[PDB]
Protein backbone atom coordinates (compact mmCIF):
# COMPACT_ATOMS: atom_id res chain seq x y z
CA UNK A 1 0.00 0.00 0.00
CA UNK A 2 2.78 2.41 -0.92
CA UNK A 3 1.82 5.99 -1.74
CA UNK A 4 3.63 5.87 -5.10
CA UNK A 5 3.20 3.53 -8.05
CA UNK A 6 6.24 1.53 -9.13
CA UNK A 7 6.87 4.00 -11.95
CA UNK A 8 6.66 7.07 -9.76
CA UNK A 9 8.79 5.27 -7.17
CA UNK A 10 11.35 4.66 -9.93
CA UNK A 11 11.29 8.41 -10.48
CA UNK A 12 11.45 9.13 -6.72
CA UNK A 13 14.50 6.97 -5.95
CA UNK A 14 16.51 8.90 -8.57
CA UNK A 15 15.96 12.29 -6.89
CA UNK A 16 18.89 13.44 -4.73
CA UNK A 17 18.53 15.08 -1.32
CA UNK A 18 20.90 18.00 -1.92
CA UNK A 19 21.48 19.80 -5.23
CA UNK A 20 25.12 18.72 -5.50
CA UNK A 21 24.91 15.64 -3.31
CA UNK A 22 25.45 11.93 -3.83
CA UNK A 23 22.61 10.76 -1.54
CA UNK A 24 19.37 9.65 -3.21
CA UNK A 25 15.86 9.60 -1.80
CA UNK A 26 14.51 6.25 -0.61
CA UNK A 27 11.12 4.69 0.12
CA UNK A 28 11.79 4.81 3.87
CA UNK A 29 11.70 8.62 3.66
CA UNK A 30 8.09 8.39 2.46
CA UNK A 31 7.35 5.88 5.21
CA UNK A 32 8.86 8.21 7.83
CA UNK A 33 6.91 11.19 6.46
CA UNK A 34 3.65 9.22 6.65
CA UNK A 35 4.54 8.18 10.21
CA UNK A 36 5.41 11.78 11.18
CA UNK A 37 2.23 13.42 9.87
CA UNK A 38 0.21 11.63 12.57
CA UNK A 39 2.22 13.49 15.24
CA UNK A 40 0.84 16.78 13.88
CA UNK A 41 -2.61 15.11 13.65
CA UNK A 42 -2.66 15.73 9.90
CA UNK A 43 -4.58 13.19 7.82
CA UNK A 44 -1.93 10.92 6.21
CA UNK A 45 -4.29 9.93 3.38
CA UNK A 46 -3.75 13.32 1.75
CA UNK A 47 -0.26 12.16 0.71
CA UNK A 48 -1.92 10.11 -2.05
CA UNK A 49 -2.97 13.07 -4.23
CA UNK A 50 -1.27 16.19 -5.53
CA UNK A 51 -4.09 18.28 -4.07
CA UNK A 52 -3.61 16.61 -0.69
CA UNK A 53 0.12 17.30 -0.80
CA UNK A 54 -0.60 20.94 -1.66
CA UNK A 55 -2.97 21.13 1.31
CA UNK A 56 -0.50 19.60 3.76
CA UNK A 57 2.17 22.03 2.52
CA UNK A 58 -0.22 24.96 2.95
CA UNK A 59 -0.87 23.87 6.54
CA UNK A 60 2.80 23.23 7.46
CA UNK A 61 4.16 26.40 5.79
CA UNK A 62 3.53 28.99 8.58
CA UNK A 63 5.44 26.79 11.08
CA UNK A 64 8.64 26.74 8.98
CA UNK A 65 10.10 30.06 10.14
CA UNK A 66 10.70 28.63 13.63
CA UNK A 67 10.38 24.98 12.64
CA UNK A 68 12.58 22.18 13.93
CA UNK A 69 14.74 19.92 11.77
CA UNK A 70 11.92 17.36 11.68
CA UNK A 71 9.37 19.87 10.41
CA UNK A 72 11.75 21.20 7.74
CA UNK A 73 12.57 17.63 6.65
CA UNK A 74 8.88 16.75 6.46
CA UNK A 75 8.04 19.91 4.51
CA UNK A 76 10.82 19.27 1.98
CA UNK A 77 9.85 15.59 1.59
CA UNK A 78 6.20 16.48 0.96
CA UNK A 79 7.29 19.17 -1.52
CA UNK A 80 9.25 16.58 -3.49
CA UNK A 81 6.33 14.12 -3.31
CA UNK A 82 4.03 16.86 -4.64
CA UNK A 83 6.41 17.36 -7.56
CA UNK A 84 6.48 13.59 -8.21
CA UNK A 85 2.66 13.52 -8.24
CA UNK A 86 2.65 16.47 -10.63
CA UNK A 87 5.22 14.36 -12.55
CA UNK A 88 7.52 17.37 -12.80
CA UNK A 89 11.01 16.11 -13.67
CA UNK A 90 12.70 17.84 -10.75
CA UNK A 91 16.19 16.60 -9.90
CA UNK A 92 16.63 17.87 -6.32
CA UNK A 93 14.82 19.38 -3.34
CA UNK A 94 15.80 22.91 -4.33
CA UNK A 95 14.30 22.40 -7.79
CA UNK A 96 11.15 21.03 -6.12
CA UNK A 97 10.94 24.06 -3.82
CA UNK A 98 11.48 26.51 -6.70
CA UNK A 99 8.81 24.71 -8.75
CA UNK A 100 6.34 25.11 -5.88
CA UNK A 101 7.35 28.72 -5.17
CA UNK A 102 6.72 29.63 -8.81
CA UNK A 103 3.04 28.79 -8.25
CA UNK A 104 2.74 31.47 -5.56
CA UNK B 1 49.71 27.87 14.28
CA UNK B 2 45.94 27.90 13.88
CA UNK B 3 44.44 30.37 11.42
CA UNK B 4 42.10 31.82 14.06
CA UNK B 5 42.84 33.38 17.43
CA UNK B 6 41.28 31.74 20.48
CA UNK B 7 38.56 34.41 20.52
CA UNK B 8 37.67 34.04 16.87
CA UNK B 9 37.81 30.26 17.30
CA UNK B 10 35.34 30.65 20.18
CA UNK B 11 33.13 32.48 17.69
CA UNK B 12 33.73 29.87 14.97
CA UNK B 13 32.81 26.80 17.03
CA UNK B 14 29.40 28.33 17.77
CA UNK B 15 28.44 28.65 14.08
CA UNK B 16 26.19 25.84 12.82
CA UNK B 17 26.58 24.12 9.46
CA UNK B 18 22.94 24.33 8.36
CA UNK B 19 20.48 27.13 9.17
CA UNK B 20 18.19 24.90 11.23
CA UNK B 21 20.73 22.25 12.15
CA UNK B 22 22.22 20.95 15.38
CA UNK B 23 25.76 20.41 14.03
CA UNK B 24 28.38 23.04 14.87
CA UNK B 25 31.55 23.93 13.01
CA UNK B 26 34.82 22.55 14.39
CA UNK B 27 38.53 23.33 14.08
CA UNK B 28 39.08 20.21 11.96
CA UNK B 29 36.97 21.82 9.22
CA UNK B 30 39.53 24.65 9.02
CA UNK B 31 42.33 22.08 9.02
CA UNK B 32 40.65 20.16 6.18
CA UNK B 33 40.09 23.37 4.20
CA UNK B 34 43.76 24.32 4.56
CA UNK B 35 44.73 20.79 3.48
CA UNK B 36 42.35 20.91 0.49
CA UNK B 37 43.50 24.27 -0.91
CA UNK B 38 46.87 22.72 -1.81
CA UNK B 39 45.09 20.31 -4.17
CA UNK B 40 43.91 23.31 -6.22
CA UNK B 41 47.44 24.78 -5.89
CA UNK B 42 46.00 27.83 -4.12
CA UNK B 43 48.28 29.50 -1.57
CA UNK B 44 47.00 28.38 1.87
CA UNK B 45 48.52 31.43 3.59
CA UNK B 46 45.73 33.60 2.21
CA UNK B 47 43.36 31.99 4.74
CA UNK B 48 44.95 34.21 7.41
CA UNK B 49 43.45 37.52 6.20
CA UNK B 50 40.00 38.69 5.17
CA UNK B 51 41.47 39.95 1.89
CA UNK B 52 43.05 36.55 1.26
CA UNK B 53 39.75 34.81 1.94
CA UNK B 54 38.01 37.20 -0.47
CA UNK B 55 40.64 36.39 -3.10
CA UNK B 56 40.32 32.62 -2.68
CA UNK B 57 36.53 32.95 -2.94
CA UNK B 58 36.88 35.05 -6.10
CA UNK B 59 39.06 32.34 -7.62
CA UNK B 60 36.87 29.38 -6.59
CA UNK B 61 33.54 31.03 -7.54
CA UNK B 62 33.43 30.27 -11.32
CA UNK B 63 33.93 26.54 -10.60
CA UNK B 64 30.85 26.30 -8.34
CA UNK B 65 28.22 25.85 -11.06
CA UNK B 66 29.61 22.39 -11.91
CA UNK B 67 31.59 21.96 -8.69
CA UNK B 68 31.84 18.73 -6.73
CA UNK B 69 30.77 18.29 -3.10
CA UNK B 70 34.35 18.98 -1.99
CA UNK B 71 34.55 22.28 -3.87
CA UNK B 72 31.16 23.43 -2.55
CA UNK B 73 32.18 22.46 1.00
CA UNK B 74 35.47 24.34 0.66
CA UNK B 75 33.77 27.42 -0.78
CA UNK B 76 31.21 27.52 2.05
CA UNK B 77 33.89 26.98 4.72
CA UNK B 78 36.02 29.81 3.33
CA UNK B 79 32.94 32.05 3.14
CA UNK B 80 32.27 31.45 6.84
CA UNK B 81 35.96 32.04 7.67
CA UNK B 82 35.81 35.32 5.74
CA UNK B 83 32.80 36.35 7.83
CA UNK B 84 34.65 35.40 11.04
CA UNK B 85 37.64 37.52 9.96
CA UNK B 86 35.28 40.40 9.19
CA UNK B 87 33.89 39.61 12.68
CA UNK B 88 30.35 39.63 11.29
CA UNK B 89 28.10 37.87 13.79
CA UNK B 90 26.70 35.40 11.27
CA UNK B 91 24.95 32.36 12.75
CA UNK B 92 24.99 29.93 9.79
CA UNK B 93 26.44 29.28 6.35
CA UNK B 94 23.42 30.78 4.61
CA UNK B 95 23.82 33.99 6.60
CA UNK B 96 27.52 34.00 5.67
CA UNK B 97 26.70 33.54 1.98
CA UNK B 98 24.05 36.28 2.05
CA UNK B 99 26.49 38.62 3.80
CA UNK B 100 29.05 38.01 1.05
CA UNK B 101 26.47 38.26 -1.76
CA UNK B 102 25.35 41.66 -0.45
CA UNK B 103 28.84 42.98 -1.27
CA UNK B 104 28.39 42.14 -4.97
Amino acid sequence: ASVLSGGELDKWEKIRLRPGGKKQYKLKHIVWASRELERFAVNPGLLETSEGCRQILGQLQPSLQTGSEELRSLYNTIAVLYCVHQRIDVKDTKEALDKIEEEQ
Amino acid sequence: ASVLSGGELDKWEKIRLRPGGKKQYKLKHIVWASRELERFAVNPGLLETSEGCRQILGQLQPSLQTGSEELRSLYNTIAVLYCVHQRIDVKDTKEALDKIEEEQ
Binding site: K23, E70, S73 | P19
Partner: peptide
Protein backbone atom coordinates in the same frame (compact mmCIF):
# COMPACT_ATOMS: atom_id res chain seq x y z
CA UNK C 1 15.50 7.42 13.14
CA UNK C 2 14.73 7.78 9.44
CA UNK C 3 14.44 11.46 8.59
CA UNK C 4 16.25 12.64 5.43
CA UNK C 5 18.99 15.25 5.30
CA UNK C 6 16.75 17.39 3.10
CA UNK C 7 17.60 20.83 4.43
Amino acid sequence: KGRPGNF
